[PDB]
Subunit: 335 residues, 4 copies
């Protein structure tokens, strides 16, 4: 049995030792330490050599090579509005995860940040005055409305090409296919989705129309009717990523559809081997967002022998620390 | 200037008086009282007749549903359909008291499956290992046997066969809302929310319909019978049109996530809902949309500036039946 | 096994049936139903006749007669600022509970409401403007500063008498003794503490000085030095209420010291027989406020065979409903 | 106008840069950055010298502690003393970096008991029955053997005997803070927070000191040796005087409850703290003082209007060591 003991600042300030001490500090600090261990277990399993074949690509319909552990990373839109956008972009840029799952805000806000920035503000700011000045609030963040005007100008010509390619080149569009195209078009190394499509990391977002991107598509469809986005084919693509995995881990930031969609794909292989949740949602109202990992065990979305971890924390604080002690330590092994 | 005072039980248990007294009790009790006022304002507006000019603009809807002076969007998370709030929602839909539903995938199939097999009471603390071993799945403090989903598979597969056939031979262009209407017709059971929704021409939107057991079944089905397409773009036009050509709109949103965002974003298209009540336990401090106060939506134009929206920070399983008792259920005669 | 089913409004509106249906509705509605049952179990045990003696009074040093179940009711100050003040006053007026535990705000705000009201406001109101207008915010409630001026005028002459009685009539003051005296002085049937002292229900508040009452005592002590408030004797009084109980129940609204103090007194009898918590606090930071009842079982503050219930809810909503279906149904049996 | 940008790990793991980048990351990460700025402002003020006039007013304190330009109140709940944050708090107290402590009863005795026997890591989910049967008590995901309290009984009883004797024969008028100072002297262990507090003349206030294991022991003791009095009125004068004759005040408050309220109410006596940082997970919507935003305290005059207080919505076990690393620990040389 391990004793409780916090970091002793009489040693001075060594950050690596400070973070290691979280494991024995208790409460959510201990769960953070447990999360470092689970993610490092995922990474070490991923780095094990493997031997397998063209077969894989025919049943997944993916160009992505299999590894010894397929890592699903899911995150809510607000985290793409935050600086965790840079954290996620880093992992995708270096091919450290295999599948992304977000909400529609979580696609478009990455793209818009390549056109214009998001600013710091305060939770307290009143909507009346903000609206009168053309500013939209996201938590304690602020996005000028003009940001979406620039987004519209950038996007309309691409939508025109997508409709044309659909009606004459046979393209059957889905959200993931669309997200890849937008990342290719934004063509900017600051963008998560630019790196994802370059590295053949698919992005699933079955509610992609539920945001500003949806708005644009709606307005565009009266100037250029025709665009269809199918969600059934994306279901086959994400589920096959899970079924034909050697091992799977889930890193899930926040709740909602991103949490559920990743968990349900792993129910196809009767469960994920590793799982970390980081969110502030609570169980007591029965919502999937607030459920402990152990609920997902009852369903088989996480294997009974797994040691899943939830850290009850704002991921804006915890996720960069987690990456610092896990993925960022093994950068040499990813090149 | 309104003074704080609680209900005095020296008067006896006068239930209506006790509920009315929440308004002056403070904290979330006062917010409940404000939510009752906001929903009654939605209902009073809804029953007001359309002038000639208003009728002209609302008829632009190519939908069969009679247009009213207030189009009410009801959104709820899947857990509430697993709960007994399924019963509350079904009643409102049965009597045409709301006009548009928004939910998540689980929120469709658990209503249908409850017409095949029940959900049971459990405890939050039950461990996943022993439950999984006995083929019981946990939803909060509720429990659903795996057998339930088998029954659902046997029921749904044939319908999936027919939908593919109608897609391919009759030109049907399926969307989530059209599939949900169809599944409601098939279930053909007056205990079902979606049975009543399709009977009463109340559309159901669920852009992430594939993310659950229904998706599992579509996925398996697609291998013995491929090609089913569910387009989300057409549904986006359909929900947005409900908001654009409304004389007035109200939002009643239970929980967070896509249901909260999708309803509010549809109302951005008319420069804001006139009335809105949120009921949920999510907190704002992580910047989630689920935990945002209504005043954030005001920032965006999703709720009008002159509106007086209300958030009640409570589990809807407690609050929503009380809210309905004090609002819609008092005007039942006006809806039949 | 019980099926989930909510109330069917096709029956019309019968509130008693509506509340009963919470038990089968799920999530916190089910826990509410479980709480109704636990409190009704407490009340039914309390109403069982008993046979015992003067002995009791000598080891508790209390005039309160023993019953078959001693009910401890604890609540945080904010609930005395709310209308739950009326709910609590009703239970105390009719001798339905045996021991009260609150914080200091929870004493003085009951007394002040007999001099001037608390008003409705909003959580959003900014402190700068409120302070400039002499208004203090409590959640979405508002208390003018003048309220505390009236309180000061009312209280100073009583403090003078208490110091005099201490230094010449031997009175050894404690918080509970003081709270009884203040309830006697306010002499107003709207006051919780007026009814508590009339019915010999003791009020424990070991941090009584941590509020406006504390302020006043502080200022008074420079005009009239001498007042001592001992907490050791109040410890003996509350613990003996628990030790010499036939059975005990705890109804605890909110967290903090009120939750802990009641639970620790019941650790003296190796546990309470019935227990209901109503609060919105969460466990994940390890605080006693957010702990589930099952933590208290590990300590022996609740008996292993008990079936304690926590309702995760604002007590301003839930407590009047709970009382309506429990204590208020048995009013005839309390007269 | 400050843009949102996160730390770019393409730069490597530069820990100081990563922590500084929280300020522009958003949500609670930005609040952490603001908390670092507020605490560094407290520290910079504290190290500024007292002018002649300022020295004159602060010396009015009849306390031994050297007065500084900023009196810092550190408050924390009992659970944090059970956690490894005990280690963080002890360091600050050891090096005279704070001036007044406020805690709850558990917050005193668990520090002393850790000098007799350790606390262990557990899980939140461990069931109370099997723990009780094996004489293990649960504190969140931490575990304390019952034996710990037996060791504490054997250690404390003799001291209680002496305090009664000094009360009765030497005229000692005991209060919670005086008892805590005495228990710190007795423990005589440099791992103990209260050892260092009494060594450095840092008073500890705990009006509800009786509400826990220490109270249990006082209670039992009072039967073989009655009469111990702990007066809370004198301690009220003592904490209030620390605030009234301060040149400047800062509050660092971890968690809610009496510690939060008592520190803030002491600062009402000077018409407000100049600096304040709250770290806790409590929510405002039930109207609790624990969950109130700092701006509520502004309403009361507990925090000055011109202050820029900060609440970080996080478990302090995560945040507080990071905060200390970026503030107090960078100025260690100035405090020795």
């Amino acid at each position: 049995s391990t004793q409780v003991r916090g970091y002793d600042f009489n040693r001075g300030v060594n950050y690596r030792a400070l973070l290691e001490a979280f494991g024995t500090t208790g409460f959510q600090a201990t769960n953070f330490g447990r999360a470092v261990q689970q993610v490092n277990a995922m990474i070490e399993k991923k780095l094990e050599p493997l031997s397998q074949d063209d077969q894989h690509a025919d049943l997944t319909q993916s160009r992505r090579p299999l590894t010894s552990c397929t890592i699903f990373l899911g995150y809510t839109s607000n985290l793409i509005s935050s600086g965790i956008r840079e954290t996620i972009r880093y992992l995708v840029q270096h091919n450290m995860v295999d599948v992304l799952v977000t909400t529609a805000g979580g696609v478009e806000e990455d793209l818009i940040k390549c056109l214009a920035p998001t600013y710091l503000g305060e939770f307290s700011l009143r909507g009346k005055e903000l609206r009168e000045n053309g500013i939209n609030r996201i938590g304690n963040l602020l996005v000028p409305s003009e940001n979406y005007c620039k987004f519209e100008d950038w996007l309309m010509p691409i939508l025109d090409q997508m409709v044309m390619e659909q009606n004459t080149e046979g393209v059957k569009w889905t959200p993931s296919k669309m997200i890849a195209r937008l990342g290719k078009e934004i063509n900017n190394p600051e963008s998560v989705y630019y790196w994802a499509q370059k590295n053949h990391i698919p992005v699933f977002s079955p509610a992609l129309t539920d945001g500003s991107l949806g708005d644009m598509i709606f307005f565009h469809s009266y100037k250029n009717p025709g665009l269809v986005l199918d969600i059934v084919e994306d279901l086959r693509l994400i589920n096959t990523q899970a079924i034909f995995a050697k091992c799977t881990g889930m890193i899930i930031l926040g709740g909602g559809v991103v949490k559920h969609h990743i968990a349900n794909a792993n129910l196809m292989r009767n469960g994920a081997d590793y799982a970390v949740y980081i969110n502030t949602a609570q169980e007591f109202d029965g919502s999937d967002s607030g459920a402990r990992p152990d609920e997902a065990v009852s369903w088989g979305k996480i294997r009974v022998d797994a040691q899943p971890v939830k850290v009850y924390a704002d991921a804006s604080l915890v996720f960069p620390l987690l990456v610092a002690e896990t993925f960022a330590q093994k950068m040499d092994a990813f090149m």
